[PDB]
């Protein structure tokens, strides 16, 4: 999107979100990132929403096809699952490439650096969901490493109710439960995250309280399912 203005790319990403055109949204925000400037808080959210929707559709389709394939065990179901899988891996690789060139290395503030590292953990986690070969373990460790670095920064630099800190802990707990086969670590992280947020709620305004309690409910929903 090299011939489009950065501001036009951002404005069109917002329009694509309104039209529920998430592939367009992602391409516009990919173009905005490749302009080389850092992203604002709002712009980071647009980037994240766009690719979460795109990969979310791919993951949902992959699970449908993987389920059909497992029940069947001609080549068509496997071939088509492989096609969707390859397209999903390409989207994850694209996002990871944006983070590596050069969003993360230019992110100096806690809010931006933790946001991008959480992203990095998430997209390695999506790669891990479909991984089966020689690199499943290496992909899992890449996800863990990104989440862990984000955790370390957020615990040092953000309050326990910060929505990015809470969403990071939520997703890392899902990583532990669903990917790393560590349900006790998942439950422990979710419980400690919830309890430390609850004790900090008194410091918040009405609007910040709503933002934080929304994500604490997601932690509670998982604990209810896991225990």
């Amino acid at each position: 999107m090299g011939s489009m203005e950065r501001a036009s790319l951002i404005q069109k990403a917002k329009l694509a979100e309104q039209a529920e055109r998430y592939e367009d949204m992602a391409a516009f925000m990919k173009g905005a990132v490749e302009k080389g400037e850092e992203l604002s808080c709002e712009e980071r959210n647009l980037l994240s929403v766009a690719y979460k929707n795109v990969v979310g559709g791919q993951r949902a389709a992959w699970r449908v096809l993987s389920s059909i394939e497992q029940k069947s065990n001609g080549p068509e179901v496997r071939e088509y699952r492989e096609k969707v899988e390859t397209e999903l891996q390409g989207v994850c690789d694209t996002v990871l490439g944006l983070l590596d060139s050069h969003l993360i290395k230019e992110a100096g503030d806690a809010e931006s650096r933790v946001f991008y590292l959480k992203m990095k953990g998430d997209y390695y986690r999506y790669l891990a969901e479909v991984a089966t070969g020689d690199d499943k373990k290496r992909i899992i460790d890449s996800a863990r490493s990104a989440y862990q670095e984000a955790m370390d920064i957020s615990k040092k630099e953000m309050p326990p109710t910060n929505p990015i800190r809470l969403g990071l802990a939520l997703n890392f707990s899902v990583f532990h439960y669903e990917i790393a086969n560590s349900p006790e670590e998942a439950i422990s992280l979710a419980k400690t995250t919830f309890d430390e947020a609850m004790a900090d709620l008194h410091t918040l305004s009405e609007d910040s309280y709503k933002d934080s309690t929304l994500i604490m409910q997601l932690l509670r929903d998982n604990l209810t399912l896991w225990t």
Binding site: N45, L46, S48, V49, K52, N53, G56, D122, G167, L170, N171, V174, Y177, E178, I215, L218, D221, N222, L225, W226
Partner: peptide, 9 residues
Amino acid sequence: AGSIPGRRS
């Protein structure tokens, strides 16, 4: 088990 939906905003 739910990650953050993250698909709106």
